[PDB]
Ligand binder design. Structure first.
Ligand SMILES: Nc1nc2c(ncn2[C@@H]2O[C@H](COP(=O)(O)OP(=O)(O)OP(=O)(O)O)[C@@H](O)[C@H]2O)c(=O)[nH]1
Ligand SMILES: Nc1ncnc2c1ncn2[C@@H]1O[C@H](COP(=O)(O)OP(=O)(O)CP(=O)(O)O)[C@@H](O)[C@H]1O
Ligand SMILES: Nc1nc2c(ncn2[C@@H]2O[C@H](COP(=O)(O)OP(=O)(O)O)[C@@H](O)[C@H]2O)c(=O)[nH]1
Ligand SMILES: Cc1ccnc(Nc2ccc([N+](=O)[O-])c(NCCN3CCOCC3)n2)c1
Ligand SMILES: [Ca+2]
Ligand SMILES: [Ca+2]
Ligand SMILES: [Mg+2]
Ligand SMILES: [Mg+2]
Ligand SMILES: [Mg+2]
Lengths: 54, 314, 428, 437
């Protein structure tokens, strides 16, 4: 096993041990989703009020 | 009231274990998908080990050792033995074997010409035991089946009762296409032998008879001439993979029943052929063996309200 | 999610409602005058859920008392804690409802509903975060069932985004006032299916059977029955008004207890079952509380849990006890009844513990089950409805108020749909 | 020096943040009033600890953190807690009603009205940063706010901070310590929506932490405070490189480079040792070999699974205390022959090691005992896919009947998002199987 990249300082030290080698949407689209959901709520609530009106 | 589920309807062994557990009045069978089980009799393929041991307040046990497939697959067994230092390439009880992707007599899974076997593979290669021990009268081949139970603590229990699976037709060196006298498998002898069942019922000779024959025929015993090697072979294989399959510190526990198949040559040397992870039992021995599983593999974890095994210390 | 608005309508609604307020008032240390005289600040940590405050440091129940005749509400004022209620919150008529769903829902009740809504609106306008409404009423009478459901429908219209919770008493021939109770209940159940989020099914048949069989009361009164309803109402509201590991609210309750919108009818249970004024000297062990609350004999709804399956289950323990033992006993009752829980809702049993015990008991347990076995209750009502309806018996009391036969046929169909809906999830 | 901003969402993220920042102050000597005497540069500094603390003219060190909860009860305790002075009021953001354990209610309904306010407060901390690295986001999978609002915030942060890294500390749901029956739903919905937006996520299974408290701390009924103090230790080990002088994982980008060869498979398994009870006054201090071997015992992992049946893509050993490289290399050599650690063929079999000489700090009066050396191992093993299978199966059981789905559809969310989220999880499970089977 080979020890490489040994770094030392006052707080400690780091190194690497090798045992063997190898063999987004835009803000526009986000609103189109959030407002699309709020509209489905408005529709479902309008149906409720309409049903209560009958 | 312990609970268990069944997920392999084709397992004759655990169908009997399921029967005994119910008869105790202290075990309850749930639907195959109820996650609130104490014991699982899992399936043979893609058993969901990753879902065991996550139910609050439930100690869960399964009848299979995750990773034991490395020992029960013919291709995996060869790679395990060659690449494990404990087993080594100098192993003296495993026939010479090689993996191939699609006296000089070999077998593939029987031919003496290499090109004949390589064309069939494209259509594991192991050295064929050209000098096998032959029963008499009959001049016939056989193999030995040993049942081994490994509990959650990784105790290795060897069932005192073994079975010999014999060839009704006398062995012949001349023609390898005979097969019925070259392959000892029970199913084949039923559908390829007019001699089927002449000497021993169902081509199944048990230890008391085999011991007697060895004493009369060879002035030796089964324990000394064969069983010592069998017990060593069993101990060696299961100790090799113990660090890879042990459930000592797992959130679920495993036990498994294995079926070791051995061959014995003319000089009373035992050879390992293969290991089966989902073995079937002998007709007469089901009652005793299945109760033995409940005694040492189930009730040891879930107690209720002489031994038939031989503990192979390691 | 803080304050809840309580509403009690009709005779049964106001009698069990009045008993509920004097029981929790005692648990929170509020006396009949509305002033606190307790010893633990845990009694006030969440007192605003059910109580308002006024100058002089007085707590007034956020309750509205509704009825079409003054009789029962005159009883409340002269009752033990009658003076705690805000006087403006008494809204009552004079004609009555005559045990007639039509009178409460369409005629007599329609005349009085708007003044009840004015009081409701005034209570809600003061709320910093209104959870919703809890209503106490019976389904077999006229005011509670007929006008109670009219109020529910109109409250949902004005507050569509608030939770509607009810304690609804089912009628029973064993404790029946009139022969038309199956009519009034069937019409009401349909309303509850559409316009409530959670309903505690308090079955007068179960209450009677408990008093007679278990409590050994040869002739139980409504007071004996309301003793069981009182204990259950305290239990199922403990986690709403006391600080604890589970600070419940009406919405979280519905989200976790109701997997399907229409199947929101709960089976309540209590343990230990006790008679009024009869002091119990031996406290129950945790195993006894767990076994009893899951026992069919402790259910406040005359249904056999073994005849159906649990969709969701909640158990609230009260008193000083071992949680470890609570956890162990819960897992063991689940194992005994492992066959009666649906396997397609993992971890569908919720356990909560409150350290403050109710009056008279050093420890108790309240059961809340959403079981498909509740169909037996709706099926019982349906058979009694159909027995009279196939001959149009007593229908003239309703057609005389403007109703048509078709509305009864629709109520009959809706309840049978509800029963069949429970049945499909019982064979899933 | 490059600053890091911590974002705590929902009850789980807030209360865990309390434990982390309490431990940070003890480790760095920062008092509850924000005073840090050892800091001789008053009002400014380019030190390592300035990555997590800014300074005021009065010499107050304030965390670069933001606490967000739709309900005010939990954050109110931070406003009146022992560390009230630590944060300024603008960092603690609360609503009036929570998400009711409903992912859709936290993502679409109630989150839409507070997302802009939160982004504005986060922008106020970013403007005090000369070279912002990215964000550390703490949240639960099961809560409505922890799952619903986090995914919404993660989406916006990618838009407003396209160049900055984002690491997660996620609480995987466990029925032992659950609060809602729909936690499987919320877990899948938030994992699907956050996957493309998180560079590295450290999952902590409450079941694993619960059992570690019972077994190793002898606590019969662990509380959230017990769980969170153990969790803060692991978080402290992971972030120690950002807050102290060192060379391993010095900036958030290194976490992806060292631990995440495949971006979608960005869930490293954390193992910690030792966990000793403060009740024992006598425990023998374990050696480097003994704690390093413990990192390969399933009982010490933050997520219960079997690393023996998976492939490693990267391994990081983070030591704190009396540790020298000679002993570390000796332990590694021993463990490699006593256990079968199988890396992917396209990855070098190796370990990146980091040593911090300062021993682990423990909260005074806690249940964790002081030790002379401890280690946290971060291994990106395909074995963690077991946790995904478990969670996806519970999801399947409920969704086959559409149980509780109407609560989500009622908030404007569509049913197709359930199947969409589950399909992404199915693809995630195939990625694991193709890499380590
Ligand atoms: N480890 C740990 N887990 C917690 C803690 N608090 C909550 N959880 C877990 O988080 C899950 C529930 O999510 P919460 O964070 O409580 O809910 P929320 O984020 O506030 O969102 P709401 O539903 O709106 O309240 C459960 O699985 C809990 O086990 C905590 O302090 N520590
Ligand atoms: N190398 C070898 N030398 C001699 N005989 C061999 C041999 N390999 C296989 N055989 C014969 O073939 C028979 C079965 O071969 P095999 O190992 O595949 O068992 P099997 O898998 O076909 C069924 P089972 O699980 O019951 O053993 C053995 O019992 C033996 O008689
Ligand atoms: N449990 C209980 N049931 C009651 C009580 N009073 C009436 N009931 C039941 O309620 C039904 C009658 O409804 P009631 O409330 O009296 O008529 P209303 O005034 O029009 O609402 C019958 O089925 C009674 O059995 C009571 O105090 N307790
Ligand atoms: C079935 C179940 C399974 C798993 N997790 C829950 N979680 C939960 C979370 C919040 C509330 N909650 O009510 O806020 C709640 N309610 C349960 C019923 N309650 C009725 C009133 O008394 C208290 C009990 N359940 C419920
Ligand atoms: Ca009139
Ligand atoms: Ca400074
Ligand atoms: Mg075989
Ligand atoms: Mg009346
Ligand atoms: Mg919350």
């Amino acid at each position: 096993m080979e020890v490489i990249e040994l770094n030392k300082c006052t707080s400690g030290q780091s190194f690497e041990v090798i045992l063997k080698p190898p063999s987004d949407p835009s803000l526009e689209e986000i609103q189109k989703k959030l407002e699309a959901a709020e509209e489905r709520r408005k529709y479902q609530e309008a149906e409720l009020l309409k049903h209560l009106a009958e | 009231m312990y609970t268990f589920v069944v997920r392999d309807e084709n397992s004759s062994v655990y169908a009997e274990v399921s029967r005994l557990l119910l008869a105790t009045g202290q075990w309850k069978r749930l639907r195959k998908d109820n996650p609130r089980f104490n014991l699982m009799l899992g399936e043979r393929n893609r058993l969901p080990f990753g879902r065991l041991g996550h139910e609050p307040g439930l100690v869960q046990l399964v009848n299979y050792y995750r990773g034991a497939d490395k020992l029960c697959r013919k291709a995996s067994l060869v790679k395990l033995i060659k690449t494990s230092p404990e087993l080594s390439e100098s192993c003296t009880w495993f026939p010479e074997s090689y993996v191939i992707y699609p006296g000089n007599v070999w077998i593939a899974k029987i031919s003496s010409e290499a090109s004949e076997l390589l064309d069939f593979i494209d259509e594991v290669i192991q050295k064929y035991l050209e000098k096998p021990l032959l029963l008499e009268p009959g001049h016939r081949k056989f193999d030995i089946r040993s049942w081994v139970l490994v509990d959650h603590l990784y105790n290795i229990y060897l069932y005192r009762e073994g079975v010999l699976r014999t060839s009704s037709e006398p062995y012949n060196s001349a023609n390898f296409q005979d097969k019925t006298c070259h392959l000892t498998n029970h199913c084949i002898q039923k559908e390829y032998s007019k001699n089927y069942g002449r000497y021993e019922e169902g081509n199944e000779m048990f230890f008391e008879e085999f011991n007697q024959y060895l004493m009369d025929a060879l002035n030796t015993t089964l324990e000394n001439s064969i069983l010592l090697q069998i017990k060593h072979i069993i101990r060696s294989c299961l100790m090799c993979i113990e660090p890879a399959i042990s459930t000592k510190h797992l959130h679920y526990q495993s036990f498994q029943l294995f079926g070791f198949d051995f061959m014995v040559d003319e000089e009373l040397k035992v050879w390992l052929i293969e290991v089966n992870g989902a073995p079937a039992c002998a007709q007469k021995l089901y009652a005793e063996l299945c109760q033995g599983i409940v005694d040492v593999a189930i009730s040891s974890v879930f107690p209720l309200a002489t031994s038939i095994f031989i503990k192979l210390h390691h | 999610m803080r304050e809840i608005v309580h509403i009690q309508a009709g005779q049964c609604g106001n009698q069990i409602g009045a008993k509920f307020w004097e029981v929790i008032s005692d648990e929170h240390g509020i006396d009949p005058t509305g002033s606190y005289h307790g010893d633990s600040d845990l009694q006030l940590e969440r007192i605003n859920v059910y109580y308002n405050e006024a100058t002089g440091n007085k707590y007034v129940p956020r309750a509205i008392l509704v009825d079409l005749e003054p009789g029962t509400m005159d009883s409340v004022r002269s009752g033990p804690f009658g003076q705690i209620f805000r006087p403006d919150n008494f809204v009552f008529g004079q004609s009555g409802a005559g045990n007639n769903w039509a009178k409460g829902h369409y005629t007599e009740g329609a005349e009085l509903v708007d003044s009840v809504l004015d009081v409701v609106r005034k209570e809600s306008e003061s709320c910093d975060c209104l959870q919703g409404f809890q209503l106490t009423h019976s389904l077999g009478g006229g005011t509670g069932s007929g006008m109670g459901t009219l109020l529910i429908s109109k409250i949902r219209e004005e507050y569509p985004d608030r939770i509607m919770n009810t304690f609804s008493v089912m009628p029973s021939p064993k404790v029946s006032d009139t022969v038309v109770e199956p009519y009034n209940a069937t019409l009401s159940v349909h309303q509850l299916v559409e316009n409530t989020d959670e309903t505690y099914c308090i079955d007068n048949e179960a209450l009677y059977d408990i008093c007679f069989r278990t409590l050994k009361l040869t002739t139980p009164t409504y007071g004996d029955l309301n003793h069981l309803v009182s204990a259950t109402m305290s239990g199922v509201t403990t986690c709403l008004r006391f600080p604890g590991q589970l600070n419940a609210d009406l919405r979280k309750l519905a989200v976790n207890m109701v997997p399907f919108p229409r199947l929101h009818f709960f089976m309540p249970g209590f343990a230990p079952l006790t008679s009024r004024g009869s002091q119990q000297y031996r406290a129950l062990t945790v195993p006894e509380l767990t076994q009893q609350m899951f026992d069919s004999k402790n259910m406040m709804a005359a249904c056999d849990p073994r005849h159906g399956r649990y969709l969701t289950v909640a158990a609230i323990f009260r008193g000083r006890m071992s949680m470890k033992e609570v956890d162990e006993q819960m897992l063991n009752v689940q194992n005994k009844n492992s066959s009666y829980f649906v396997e397609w809702i993992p971890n569908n049993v919720k356990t909560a513990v409150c350290d403050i015990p109710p009056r008279g008991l050093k420890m108790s347990a309240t059961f809340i089950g959403n079981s498909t076995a509740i169909q037996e209750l709706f099926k019982r009502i349906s058979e009694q409805f159909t027995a009279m309806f196939r001959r149009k018996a007593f229908l003239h009391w309703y057609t005389g108020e403007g109703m048509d036969e078709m509305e009864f046929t629709e109520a009959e169909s809706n309840m049978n749909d509800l029963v069949s809906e429970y049945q499909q999830y019982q064979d899933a | 020096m490059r600053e890091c901003i911590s974002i705590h969402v929902g009850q789980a993220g807030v209360q865990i943040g309390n434990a982390c920042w309490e431990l940070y102050c003890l480790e760095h000597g920062i008092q509850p009033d924000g005073q840090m005497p050892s800091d001789k540069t008053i009002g400014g500094g380019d030190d390592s600890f300035n990555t997590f603390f800014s300074e005021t003219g009065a010499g107050k060190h304030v965390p670069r953190a933001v606490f967000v909860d739709l309900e005010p009860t939990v954050i109110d305790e931070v406003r009146t807690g022992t560390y009230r002075q630590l944060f300024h009021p603008e960092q603690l953001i609360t609503g009036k009603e929570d998400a009711a354990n409903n992912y859709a209610r936290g993502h679409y309904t109630i989150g839409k009205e507070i997302i802009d306010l939160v982004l504005d407060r986060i922008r106020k901390l970013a403007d005090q940063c000369t070279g912002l690295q990215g964000f550390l986001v703490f949240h639960s999978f099961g809560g409505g706010t922890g799952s619903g609002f986090t995914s919404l915030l993660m989406e916006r942060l990618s838009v407003d901070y396209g160049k900055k890294s984002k690491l997660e500390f996620s609480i995987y749901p466990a029925p032992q310590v659950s609060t809602a029956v729909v936690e499987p739903y919320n877990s899948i919905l938030t994992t699907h929506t956050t996957l493309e937006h998180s560079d590295c996520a450290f999952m902590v299974d409450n079941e694993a932490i619960y059992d570690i408290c019972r077994r190793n701390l002898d606590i019969e009924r662990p509380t959230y405070t017990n769980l969170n103090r153990l969790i803060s230790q692991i978080v402290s080990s992971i972030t120690a490189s950002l807050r102290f002088d060192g060379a391993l994982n010095v900036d958030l980008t290194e976490f992806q480079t060292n631990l995440v060869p495949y971006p979608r498979i960005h869930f490293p398994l954390a193992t910690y040792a030792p966990v000793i009870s403060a009740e024992k006054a006598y425990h023998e201090q374990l050696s480097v070999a003994e704690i390093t071997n413990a990192c390969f015992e399933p009982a010490n992992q933050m997520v219960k699974c079997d690393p023996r049946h998976g492939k490693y893509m990267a391994c990081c050993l983070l030591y704190r205390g009396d540790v020298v490289p000679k002993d570390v290399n000796a332990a590694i050599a021993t463990i490699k022959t006593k256990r079968s650690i199988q890396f992917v063929d396209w990855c070098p079999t190796g370990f990146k090691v980091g040593i911090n000489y300062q021993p682990p700090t423990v909260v005074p009066g806690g249940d964790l005992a002081k030790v002379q050396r401890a280690v946290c191992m971060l291994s990106n093993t395909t074995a963690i896919a077991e946790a995904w299978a478990r969670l996806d199966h519970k999801f399947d059981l409920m969704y086959a009947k559409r149980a509780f789905v109407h609560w989500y559809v009622g908030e404007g969310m569509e049913e197709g998002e359930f199947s969409e989220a589950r399909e992404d999880m199915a693809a995630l499970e195939k990625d694991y199987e193709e890499v380590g089977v």
